[PDB]
Amino acid sequence: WVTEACAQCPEGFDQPPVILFSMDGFRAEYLQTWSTLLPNINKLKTCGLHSKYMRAVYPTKAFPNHYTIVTGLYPESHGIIDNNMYDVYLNKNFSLSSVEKSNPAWWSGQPIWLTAMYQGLKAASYYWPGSDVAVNGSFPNIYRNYSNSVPYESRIATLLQWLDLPKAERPSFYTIYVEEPDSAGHKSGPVSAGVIKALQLVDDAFGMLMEGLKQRNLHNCVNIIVLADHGMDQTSCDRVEYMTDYFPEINFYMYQGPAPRIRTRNIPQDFFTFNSEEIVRDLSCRKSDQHFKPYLTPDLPKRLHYAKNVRIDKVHLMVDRQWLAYRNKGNCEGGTHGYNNEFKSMEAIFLAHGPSFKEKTVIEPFENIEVYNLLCDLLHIQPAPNNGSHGSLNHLLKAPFYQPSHAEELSKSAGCGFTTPLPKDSLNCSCLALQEEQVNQRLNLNRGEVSATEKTNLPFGRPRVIQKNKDHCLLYHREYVSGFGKAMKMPMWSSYTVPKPGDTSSLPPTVPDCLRADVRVDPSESQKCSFYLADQNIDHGFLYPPAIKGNNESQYDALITSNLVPMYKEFKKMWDYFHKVLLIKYAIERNGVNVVSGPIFDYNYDGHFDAPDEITNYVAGTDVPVPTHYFVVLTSCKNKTHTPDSCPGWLDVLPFVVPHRPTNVESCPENKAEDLWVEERFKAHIARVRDVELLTGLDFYQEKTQPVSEILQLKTYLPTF
Ligand SMILES: CC(=O)N[C@H]1[C@@H](OP(=O)(O)OP(=O)(O)OC[C@H]2O[C@@H](n3ccc(=O)[nH]c3=O)[C@H](O)[C@@H]2O)O[C@H](CO)[C@@H](O)[C@@H]1O
Ligand SMILES: *[C@@H]1O[C@H](CO)[C@@H](O[C@@H]2O[C@H](CO)[C@@H](O)[C@H](O)[C@H]2NC(C)=O)[C@H](O)[C@H]1NC(C)=O
Ligand SMILES: *[C@@H]1O[C@H](CO)[C@@H](O[C@@H]2O[C@H](CO)[C@@H](O)[C@H](O)[C@H]2NC(C)=O)[C@H](O)[C@H]1NC(C)=O
Ligand SMILES: *[C@@H]1O[C@H](CO)[C@@H](O[C@@H]2O[C@H](CO)[C@@H](O)[C@H](O)[C@H]2NC(C)=O)[C@H](O)[C@H]1NC(C)=O
Ligand SMILES: *[C@@H]1O[C@H](CO)[C@@H](O[C@@H]2O[C@H](CO)[C@@H](O)[C@H](O)[C@H]2NC(C)=O)[C@H](O)[C@H]1NC(C)=O
Ligand SMILES: *[C@@H]1O[C@H](CO)[C@@H](O)[C@H](O)[C@H]1NC(C)=O
Ligand SMILES: [Ca+2]
Ligand SMILES: [Zn+2]
Ligand SMILES: [Zn+2]
């Protein structure tokens, strides 16, 4: 097989069997550098399909990741948030060394073997976390109780024996797990002779499987996926942070290593009463060269989706590349994993071979949460509710099983039409510059003016409202278009295409002390300038920056009540710096940039837009809700020769989900100019368009002339730097 050229199901095989092969700790880099040393995996890389890398879930550990691959769920939803965890309600400790690993109470969701079994198919497993557990009261048709020393040849032979079974007994889905190159990675690090030997050993295991399949004439019949749970990075005992250096006495329990959690020792009693906010405060900006950052789980970057679970302790530590965090100075040599999934070293491999996959294809990176829907498509079965975007992986398949469709809008735009240029209520707003209010006629756009602003500022169409009974209206202006939320008295979204900046030297500033009522929106559905007088902590901010487009006359279209959003004074410093300096820099690099911004409400930190009853903070003595986050989605043309409003091909996206916090403690900006921490803070809160979509109840790019499957690739894309 290994010498045979790049190449078909035999009698009794109506549907192609699926084999999911996991090579633990096989980082993406190992394939990029050492593939030519691995002849069997290199043939699979040459002939089959493979991604540049597959993104794992945080923490980049075995059990949360392996269970994510087979469920399509984030650890917070499937329950396995770590290898070591504590549940207060169950009052039990989970570990790989305890019998609690086999307790079905910890395992939520529906793994692929169960999905296949519930839909008339048989499933076998030669090791996989959860497969030796009675998840939802059931085990796979054939399974093996985990035994790490069983030779690879014996595991392969048993799997080939399962494929030799008669059609009635023979399973359609198979899982197989191998401990290497992870074990070698821990011993001597990712760049060692030990990992080379381990990589050659896993190549022999894959070689035995392919040769075994060739013997049965199944090598071009079986749809095989070879992947990893996470990557590997080098550790050092000179790269360890100690909690003794920050606390005089440690009375708390700590889950040590690359993804730390802090909780009380007195469990279950003090679990909820434990001052989690005190610990994060006592660890924030303590040392200038601090190699970790403390966080309360709702404050963690939203793209991680690591907060909505009792097992996820409120205190979390984000550890820097190649560093570790422990209780005391009392392992640390070689290598480990568990770090941020965005780190290059934490990236996993993904290779596919078989009749359902595209031959000799290199695909762009994607997330392991998408594998579940792909496995369902290969097995011709319906997926259970998960976090993958069904259809985003169709570009991997020769003939896709599922055809995705645009999300249907649940609420239509109504009202806010121009009637009179004279406001019925001033809303306690003042603009001494005026005077006449003839600038209100600039808000009265004709049919051709609406079409001109729709073509420029909504080039991919308006974001659709995927919310029931959401009373809203669209507001058209020469420089921007917005979707105003009537009940919350603020826009849900604001869209505008910034053209390529010329001068940049002396740009006009924002017109000060000028704010007035919007004649198009009802006074009862509008924000008042007097609302921001009573509250001292929160002030008003502009969603669309008035001075970014046009002249002085253009600024008046944005200096209205409908462009106001509740903003913390410290947050406004980041927001105004981004729109004045960073946004112009991005518009130069991208040859113009389309911007869609708006508020996010996620008080229950579940990654979904809040229902009105879920909002727990408002502008003092008003019903105006305070956003938990602010989104900024930047869209430009992939081909930089075109502007965002005249882009025929693919698009390039850069979304941000920035926490709306009263302090900038996360950036540690004491005695530091904004050019040293604002960009770093925005970059730390980069997310996918899909993340923005879930947090807002909006759907983007529905008017882009491209198939839904290609648009889903753009929506699941995570920009990296
Ligand atoms: C074995 C090992 O080096 N584990 C390290 C890893 O944990 P982690 O839990 O992520 O495990 P690894 O990815 O390193 O290796 C797989 C582990 O899962 C077990 N397994 C695998 C498959 C299966 O079906 N069933 C099963 O029980 C293996 O016995 C092994 O212990 O990162 C931690 C980071 O803080 C380290 O402290 C741990 O020492
Ligand atoms: C746990 O197993 C039960 C039983 O197999 C599943 O319940 C079935 O769900 C389907 C789809 O909703 C229904 O058509 C069946 O009538 C249900 N059967 C019973 C006995 O209730 C359940 O969905 C499984 N749960 C998970 C998370 O996989
Ligand atoms: C995996 O190990 C468990 C034991 O930990 C086995 O479960 C036992 O199976 C017998 C029947 O063969 C039952 O009478 C026992 O009550 C079970 N014990 C427990 C604790 O569940 C299981 O059969 C093993 N699986 C394989 C494939 O060997
Ligand atoms: C789960 O493991 C932890 C850590 O080993 C145990 O924590 C101890 O809990 C008691 C109170 O029940 C405290 O007084 C001790 O100080 C804790 N020890 C440590 C090392 O933190 C906990 O008891 C275990 N729970 C179960 C149910 O096994
Ligand atoms: C990831 O997918 C899961 C499953 O669809 C989502 O969790 C469900 O959320 C609803 C409430 O919106 C609950 O009624 C279900 O019980 C949850 N199911 C499970 C298995 O937990 C989850 O919200 C999704 N996550 C994101 C961020 O979209
Ligand atoms: C970019 O667009 C121009 C036309 O404006 C075209 O000639 C060029 O080939 C495109 N570049 C790529 C990489 O497709
Ligand atoms: Ca929510
Ligand atoms: Zn692993
Ligand atoms: Zn490991």
Numbering used by the authors: 140 to 146, 152 to 474, 477 to 581, 586 to 871
Show me the paper's own sentences about this structure.
NPPs hydrolyze pyrophosphate or phosphodiester bonds. In this extensive study, we determined the crystal structure of NPP3 from Rattus norvegicus in complex with a phosphate ion and various nucleotide ligands allowing us to characterize the substrate recognition of nucleotide triphosphates, dinucleotides and nucleotide sugars by NPP3. Similar to NPP1 and NPP2, the structure of NPP3 consists of two major domains, which interact via a large interface of 1279 Å2.
The 6-membered ring is stacked by F207 and Y290. D276 interacts with the N3 atom of the substrate via one water molecule and the backbone NH of W272 interacts with the C4 carbonyl group via another water molecule. The N-acetylglucosamine group is well defined in the electron density map and its atomic B-factors are by ~10 Å2 higher than those of the ribose group, indicating a slightly increased flexibility. S237 is interacting by a water-mediated hydrogen bond with a hydroxyl group of the sugar. The participation of T482, S237 and K205 in substrate binding could be verified by mutation experiments.
